[PDB]
Amino acid sequence: MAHHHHHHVDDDDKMTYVRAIPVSNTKSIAGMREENLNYIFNTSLFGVYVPADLNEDNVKQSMLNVTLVGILFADKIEESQVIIRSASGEEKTYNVGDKIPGGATIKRIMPGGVLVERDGTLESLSLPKNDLTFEPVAKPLKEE
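The structure assignment produced for this chain is given below.
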């Protein structure tokens, strides 16, 4: 017998249309986040806070005082700039071949990823934009 076992129980309390919702706390104040919001870029003071939805734990992080916040694609590949935020908070666009402050040098600005020499260390990689040519712009790689 399942005539009693088969008994769905639903409790959508927010479906109420009467003022019976308990408002004891969060009455005069909705959270004391004075110092909390001050931790969130006090250099912006107000307005420019980071959303509580955008919580990057920094998967690869940003050492060398270099934060890749985007790329500025241009007509010429040598004219295409990289949008780098320095540790200081400065957001500037640099050209390929230029030495960025922090201990890194822009070796090649590729639209899918900028190759920078971090403290003398450089690494070559391929962009998942072409399967027939893993290496775009430079010497073509048909198979690697």
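Interim note for the steering committee: DSSP finds one helix and six strands in the chain. Strands lie at 66-72, 81-86, 91-95, 99-100, 104-110, 113-118.
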